[PDB]
Amino acid sequence: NKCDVVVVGGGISGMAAAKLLHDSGLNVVVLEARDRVGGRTYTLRNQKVKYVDLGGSYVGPTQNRILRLAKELGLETYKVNEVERLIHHVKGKSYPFRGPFPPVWNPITYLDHNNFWRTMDDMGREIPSDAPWKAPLAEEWDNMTMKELLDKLCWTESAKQLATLFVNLCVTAETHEVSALWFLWYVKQCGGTTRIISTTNGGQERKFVGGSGQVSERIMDLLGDRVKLERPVIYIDQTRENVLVETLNHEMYEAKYVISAIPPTLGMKIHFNPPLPMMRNQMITRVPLGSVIKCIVYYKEPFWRKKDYCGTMIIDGEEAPVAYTLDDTKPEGNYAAIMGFILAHKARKLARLTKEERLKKLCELYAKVLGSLEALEPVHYEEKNWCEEQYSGGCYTTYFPPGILTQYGRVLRQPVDRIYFAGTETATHWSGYMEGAVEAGERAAREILHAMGKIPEDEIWQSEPESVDVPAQPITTTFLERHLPSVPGLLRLI
Amino acid sequence: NKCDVVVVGGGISGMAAAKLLHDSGLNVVVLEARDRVGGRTYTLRNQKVKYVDLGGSYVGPTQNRILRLAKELGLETYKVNEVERLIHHVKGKSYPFRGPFPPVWNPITYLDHNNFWRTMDDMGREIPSDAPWKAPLAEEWDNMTMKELLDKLCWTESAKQLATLFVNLCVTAETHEVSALWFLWYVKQCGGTTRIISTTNGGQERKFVGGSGQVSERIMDLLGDRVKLERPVIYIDQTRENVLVETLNHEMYEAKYVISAIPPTLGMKIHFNPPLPMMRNQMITRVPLGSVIKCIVYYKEPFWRKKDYCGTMIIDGEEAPVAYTLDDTKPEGNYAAIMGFILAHKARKLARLTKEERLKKLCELYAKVLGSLEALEPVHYEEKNWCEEQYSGGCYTTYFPPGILTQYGRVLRQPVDRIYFAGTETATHWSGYMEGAVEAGERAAREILHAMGKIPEDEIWQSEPESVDVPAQPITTTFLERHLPSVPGLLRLIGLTTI
Numbered sequence: 001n002k003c004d005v006v007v008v009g010g011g012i013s014g015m016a017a018a019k020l021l022h023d024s025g026l027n028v029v030v031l032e033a034r035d036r037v038g039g040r041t042y043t044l045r046n047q048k049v050k051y052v053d054l055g056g057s058y059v060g061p062t063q064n065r066i067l068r069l070a071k072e073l074g075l076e077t078y079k080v081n082e083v084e085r086l087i088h089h090v091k092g093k094s095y096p097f098r099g100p101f102p103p104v105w106n107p108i109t110y111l112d113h114n115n116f117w118r119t120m121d122d123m124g125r126e127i128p129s130d131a132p133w134k135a136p137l138a139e140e141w142d143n144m145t146m147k148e149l150l151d152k153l154c155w156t157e158s159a160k161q162l163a164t165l166f167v168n169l170c171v172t173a174e175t176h177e178v179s180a181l182w183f184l185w186y187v188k189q190c191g192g193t194t195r196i197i198s199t200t201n202g203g204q205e206r207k208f209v210g211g212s213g214q215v216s217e218r219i220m221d222l223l224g225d226r227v228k229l230e231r232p233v234i235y236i237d238q239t240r241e242n243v244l245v246e247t248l249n250h251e252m253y254e255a256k257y258v259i260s261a262i263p264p265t266l267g268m269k270i271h272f273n274p275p276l277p278m279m280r281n282q283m284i285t286r287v288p289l290g291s292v293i294k295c296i297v298y299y300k301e302p303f304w305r306k307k308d309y310c311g312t313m314i315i316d317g318e319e320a321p322v323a324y325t326l327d328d329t330k331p332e333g334n335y336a337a338i339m340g341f342i343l344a345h346k347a348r349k350l351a352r353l354t355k356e357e358r359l360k361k362l363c364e365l366y367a368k369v370l371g372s373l374e375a376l377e378p379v380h381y382e383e384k385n386w387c388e389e390q391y392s393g394g395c396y397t398t399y400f401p402p403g404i405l406t407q408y409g410r411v412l413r414q415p416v417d418r419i420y421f422a423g424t425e426t427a428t429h430w431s432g433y434m435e436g437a438v439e440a441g442e443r444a445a446r447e448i449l450h451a452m453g454k455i456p457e458d459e460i461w462q463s464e465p466e467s468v469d470v471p472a473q474p475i476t477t478t479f480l481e482r483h484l485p486s487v488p489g490l491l492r493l494i
Numbered sequence: 495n496k497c498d499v500v501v502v503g504g505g506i507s508g509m510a511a512a513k514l515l516h517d518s519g520l521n522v523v524v525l526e527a528r529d530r531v532g533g534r535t536y537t538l539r540n541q542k543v544k545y546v547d548l549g550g551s552y553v554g555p556t557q558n559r560i561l562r563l564a565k566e567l568g569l570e571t572y573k574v575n576e577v578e579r580l581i582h583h584v585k586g587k588s589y590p591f592r593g594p595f596p597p598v599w600n601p602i603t604y605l606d607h608n609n610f611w612r613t614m615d616d617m618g619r620e621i622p623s624d625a626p627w628k629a630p631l632a633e634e635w636d637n638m639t640m641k642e643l644l645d646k647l648c649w650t651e652s653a654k655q656l657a658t659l660f661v662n663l664c665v666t667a668e669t670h671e672v673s674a675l676w677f678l679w680y681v682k683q684c685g686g687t688t689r690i691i692s693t694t695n696g697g698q699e700r701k702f703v704g705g706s707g708q709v710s711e712r713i714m715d716l717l718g719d720r721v722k723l724e725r726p727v728i729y730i731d732q733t734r735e736n737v738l739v740e741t742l743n744h745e746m747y748e749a750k751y752v753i754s755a756i757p758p759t760l761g762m763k764i765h766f767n768p769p770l771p772m773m774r775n776q777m778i779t780r781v782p783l784g785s786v787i788k789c790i791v792y793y794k795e796p797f798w799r800k801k802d803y804c805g806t807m808i809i810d811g812e813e814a815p816v817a818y819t820l821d822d823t824k825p826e827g828n829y830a831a832i833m834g835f836i837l838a839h840k841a842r843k844l845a846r847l848t849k850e851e852r853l854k855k856l857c858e859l860y861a862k863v864l865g866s867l868e869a870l871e872p873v874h875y876e877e878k879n880w881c882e883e884q885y886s887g888g889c890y891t892t893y894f895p896p897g898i899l900t901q902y903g904r905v906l907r908q909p910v911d912r913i914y915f916a917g918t919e920t921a922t923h924w925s926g927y928m929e930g931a932v933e934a935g936e937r938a939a940r941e942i943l944h945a946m947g948k949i950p951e952d953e954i955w956q957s958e959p960e961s962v963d964v965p966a967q968p969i970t971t972t973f974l975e976r977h978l979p980s981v982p983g984l985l986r987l988i989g990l991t992t993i
C-alpha cells in the first residue's frame with residue numbers, strides 16, 4: 001500500500017531514480033511488469049556463452065553517469081576489440097581500413113562523403129539539446145524525413161548508401177520513417193557523428209564484465225523487498241489527496257508522487273483518472289520504437305584476428321541480413337563471438353524465418369565478408385528479436401516521425417500533476433542509451449525532491465564529473481575537412 | 495461471466511457486430527469503456543440546440559450499409575443545405591461559386607488544378623481497396639509524405655494551397671505527417687476525389703434527423719442488459735480453452751470469441767496473454783489518429799441564405815482558425831447554425847484558448863468571409879476537442895505515417911487466435927466513416943460465424959443493395975478534363991515545337 005514514491009518500471013532509469021530517492025531517506029516502491037529487472041538490457045547466462053548482453057551493452061567516454069553508477073555497484077568495463085582492421089563491405093567486396101570512417105578514393109565521392117558528415121554536425125550546432133523544437137529552422141527540418149534530407153545533400157550514391165546505413169544503425173528505423181530534425185538532434189545530443197559511430201573514443205568503446213544486466217540486478221539487491229516483479233501498472237488515479245496506483249493482479253499502491261520510467265508510448269497501457277492533458281494523450285500514440293534483432297554467433301576461436309581483422313564489419317546492400325558487427329569475444333580471449341544487428345525493415349522481413357535459418361544466412365555472409373570458411377562452423381548461437389516485447393515495444397529507443405517533435409516534443413518530460421517522467425527518452429545527453437536512462441531517472445527523482453522542499457530548484461539538473469577510468473579525448477577536425485567544398489560548391493567554383 | 499462472443503467497444507462498429515450476432519442466435523456482451531455508447535459519434539441534446547452531432551455526422555450516396563442499418567432502426571435523413579452559393583476564401587477575399595470544385599481563371603493554374611485532382615484518381619486506380627500494399631509502386635509511394643507528392647505534382651502555389659487544405663480536411667493531419675500511399679488509398683476507397691469532397695452527390699449530402707448517436711443508442715435498446723457501460727477492458731487471456739476478458743472494475747467475462755472494435759492504437763490499453771504476435775505488437779504503436787475540434791455557432795436566422803450563400807466556406811490561410819464550414823440549420827429552418835472544423839496543427843494551437851476566445855475568433859472570421867456583421871451576434875455555441883478523448887485518441891480516424899502501411903498494413907484485420915478485428919479502420923469501403931464501421935463490424939461478426947461452421951467462407955464479405963432513399967449518381971469527367979495537359983506536359987509541347 002503506502003509509500004512516498006511509486007516508480008513505474010524497473011529498467012536502469014527506474015532503478016536509478018529509486019536508488020537516489022531511497023538514499024535520500026524516502027520510502028520507495030518499484031512496480032515492474034516482467035519477472036525480471038533490466039528492461040531493454042538483458043544478460044543471458046548459460047554454460048555455452050557464460051554471459052551475453054541480448055539488449056543494451058556498450059558504454060564509452062562522455063557517458064559519465066552510467067560509468068559512475070556501475071562503478072559504485074562494483075562493476076568493471078573492458079575494451080571492445082578494435083586492435084586490427086575494420087572491414088567495409090560494398091558491392092560484394094571487402095575493403096579493410098583503419099579509423100572511425102570508411103575511406104573513399106574517388107575525389108568527387110570524397111568531397112560528397114566529407115560534406116555529408118560535416119553538414120550533419122553543422123546542422124546539429126543550431127539544435128539545443130534540451131529543446132530541439134527551438135532550433136531556428138525547427139519546422140522546416142521537422143516536416144522533412146531523413147530520406148528527403150539525404151536526397152538533397154548526397155550527390156553520390158556511395159555517400160547516400162553509407163548515410164542510409166548510418167541512420168538505420170543509429171536509430172533502428174528507415175530514413176523515410178524519421179524526422180530530419182529529430183535525427184539531427186539525436187546525433188548532436190550524443191556529441192556528434194564521430195562520437196556516436198566510434199568504438200575507440202566513442203559510444204562502442206566498452207562493455208561491462210559480466211553484462212549490463214548487473215546494473216539493474218544489483219540495485220534491486222540494494223532495495224530488497226521494495227521491488228515488485230510481475231506487477232504491470234494498469235491504472236493511475238490522481239483525483240484524491242494521495243495518488244493511487246493499481247497493478248494487473250489487483251494490488252493497490254498509495255503515494256505522494258509517481259515516476260513513470262517506461263517508454264513514452266507504453267504509457268498507453270495505463271488508464272488515467274483524470275484523463276491525461278490533451279497533448280500528452282495524443283503524443284503517446286505518435287512515438288514508436290525501432291526494430292532490431294541482436295544476434296551473436298559463437299566460434300572455437302576469434303579466427304578473424306589471424307587475418308588482421310578486428311571483427312568490425314560495415315556491410316552495405318539489401319541482400320545482407322546484418323549491416324554491422326562487432327567482436328563479442330570475452331576480454332580473456334575465449335567464447336569467441338561475432339555480434340551483429342538485423343535492422344529496421346530487415347528485422348520485420350527475416351523474423352518469419354526459423355532461428356536455424358537466420359544462423360545459416362549470418363554464417364554465409366560472414367564467410368563472404370571475412371573471406372573465411374571458418375565462419376561456416378559456428379559452435380553456438382543466441383539472438384533476441386526486440387520487436388516482440390510487449391513491455392518494450394522495440395529497440396533501441398523511440399523515434400519521432402515527421403511533424404511530431406515540434407508539435408508534441410515539449411510535453412515529453414512535463415509533469416502531469418504528481419506524475420514525473422523518467423526513461424532514457426526524456427534525457428538531454430545520450431538519450432536512447434543506458435547513460436540517458438541514468439540522467440533521466442536521477443533528474444526525475446530530484447524534481448520530486450524539489451517539490452517536497454528538500455532541495456533548491458538549482459539542484460534538479462546536476463553535472464557529472466568525468467570518469468577517471470574512461471577519459472574522453474576531444475573530437476578534432478583537420479583543416480581540409482573543414483574547408484573542402486561540397487559537390488555543388490565545387491560546381492559553383494567552376 | 496459466460497457468453498458466445500465478447501465485443502470490446504460500443505461504437506457503431508461494435509454495436510453493428512453485436513446486433514448481427516444477436517440476430518443470429520448467439521449470446522453476446524458488449525463491453526464499453528465510457529458511460530455512453532456511440533464512441534466517435536455523440537449527439538448532445540439541450541434546449542438551446544435541440545440536438546447536435548459533436549462527432550461523426552454526415553452520410554451520403556454509396557454509403558449503403560449505414561443507411562440500411564439506420565433505416566431498420568427507424569431513422570430518417572435530411573439534405574445538408576447546398577441550394578445557394580459556396581464560398582472560396584483565398585488571400586483575404588471571398589469568391590462565390592457553384593459545383594463541387596472551386597473554379598480557377600488563370601489558364602496555367604487551371605491546368606495545374608485539373609492535373610492534381612486527375613492524378614490523385616489516376617494513382618488511386620492502381621491501389622487495391624482490400625490490399626493497398628499490393629500497389630505496383632507501393633513502397634515508392636509509401637516512403638514519401640503527401641507533402642513531397644504535392645511539391646512534385648503542383649506547379650502553382652494556388653493548386654498546392656488547395657491540395658494541402660484538401661489533405662488537412664480529409665484526414666485531420668498535415669501533409670508532412672501522412673504517407674502518400676495511405677492517403678491515395680484513403681481517397682480511392684471512398685470512391686475518388688469528387689465523391690469524397692462533395693455535398694450534393696457525395697459524402698456530406700445528408701445527416702440523420704435527431705443525430706447520428708441514435709444509431710448506437712437504439713441498438714443498445716435492442717440488446718438490453720447485454721451492453722455494459724463503464725467497463726474498460728484491461729486484459730485478454732487466451733491461454734485456456736475459453737477466452738477470458740477482464741475489465742477495470744475487476745469483472746470477468748468468458749467467451750469463445752472476441753471482437754476488438756476499438757481504434758487500432760487503443761489496443762495498447764489492453765494487456766495480452768499470451769503476448770501479441772510481433773507485427774501487431776509494433777503496429778499498434780505506429781498508428782495515431784488525427785486532430786480536430788468541431789465547433790458549432792448558432793444564430794437567430796440563417797442570414798447567409800439572404801445573400802445567396804449556402805453556408806459552405808472553403809477558407810485558405812494560416813490565419814484562419816477554421817478551414818471548412820457547412821450550414822448546420824435544422825431541416826425545419828430553425829436553430830440556424832454554422833458548423834466548422836479546426837484542423838490538425840490549428841487544433842493543437844487553438845486548444846490553449848478558452849471556449850469564449852475560440853467563439854470570438856470564429857465569428858470574426860465568418861463576418862469577413864460572409865461579408866456580414868450579423869455573424870458577430872451568436873446566440874449560442876457548442877464545441878468538442880476530440881484530441882482530449884482517452885477512449886478515442888483523436889478524430890476522425892487513424893492515419894498512417896510514411897513507411898507503415900507497407901510494413902504493417904496486412905496485420906490490421908488479421909485474427910489473433912480467437913480475437914477478430916472490427917472498427918472503421920479495418921473496412922475496405924469508406925474506412926474512417928460510419929459506413930466503414932458498419933462494414934467492419936458485420937464482417938468481423940461473420941468471420942466468427944464461419945469459424946463456428948454456421949456459414950460458408952463465401953459469405954464473410956457481403957455486398958450491399960443500393961439505398962432507394964439515397965441514390966448514387968455516377969462520377970463523370972469531361973473530354974477536356976481527361977485530355978488537357980499538365981503544366982510540365984504543356985512545357986514539353988513547347989520544347990517539341992521549338993525544334
Ligand SMILES: *Cc1cc2c(cc1C)nc1c(=O)[nH]c(=O)nc-1n2C[C@H](O)[C@H](O)[C@H](O)COP(=O)(O)OP(=O)(O)OC[C@H]1O[C@@H](n2cnc3c(N)ncnc32)[C@H](O)[C@@H]1O
Nearest residue numbers: 009011013033039040056057058233395423424432433434
Ligand atoms: C534493445 C536494445 C537496446 C540497446 C542496445 C541494443 C538493443 C538490442 N544497444 C545499446 C548500447 O549498446 N548501449 C546503450 O547504452 N544502450 C543501447 N540500448 C538501449 C538501452 O538498452 C536503453 O536506452 C535503456 O536500457 C533504456 O532504459 P529505461 O530504463 O529508460 O527503459 P527500459 O529499459 O525499457 O525500462 C522500462 C521498464 O518498465 C517496464 N514496464 C513497461 N510497462 C510497464 C507497466 N505498465 N508497468 C510496470 N512496468 C512496466 C519494462 O518491463 C521495463 O523493465
Ligand SMILES: *Cc1cc2c(cc1C)nc1c(=O)[nH]c(=O)nc-1n2C[C@H](O)[C@H](O)[C@H](O)COP(=O)(O)OP(=O)(O)OC[C@H]1O[C@@H](n2cnc3c(N)ncnc32)[C@H](O)[C@@H]1O
Nearest residue numbers: 503505507527533534550551552727889917918926927928
Ligand atoms: C470525431 C469525428 C468523427 C467523424 C466526423 C467528425 C468528428 C469530429 N465526421 C464524420 C462524418 O461526418 N461522417 C462519418 O461517417 N464519420 C465521420 N467521423 C468518423 C466516425 O465518427 C467514425 O468513423 C466512427 O464513429 C467510428 O466507429 P467505430 O465503432 O469503428 O469506432 P469508435 O466510434 O471509436 O468506437 C469505439 C468504442 O470503443 C470504446 N473503447 C475504447 N477503448 C476501450 C476499451 N479498452 N474497453 C472497452 N471499450 C473501449 C470507446 O469508448 C468507443 O465507444
Ligand SMILES: C(=C\c1ccccc1)/CCc1ccccc1
Nearest residue numbers: 100101102165166169170196197
Ligand atoms: C555507427 C557506425 C558507423 C561507422 C561508419 C559508417 C556508418 C556507421 C555505430 C552506431 C551504433 C552502433 C551500435 C549501437 C548504437 C549505435
Ligand SMILES: C(=C\c1ccccc1)/CCc1ccccc1
Nearest residue numbers: 594595596659660663664690691
Ligand atoms: C472536402 C471538401 C473540399 C472541396 C474542395 C476543395 C477542398 C476540399 C470535404 C471533405 C470532408 C468534409 C467533412 C468530413 C470529412 C471529409
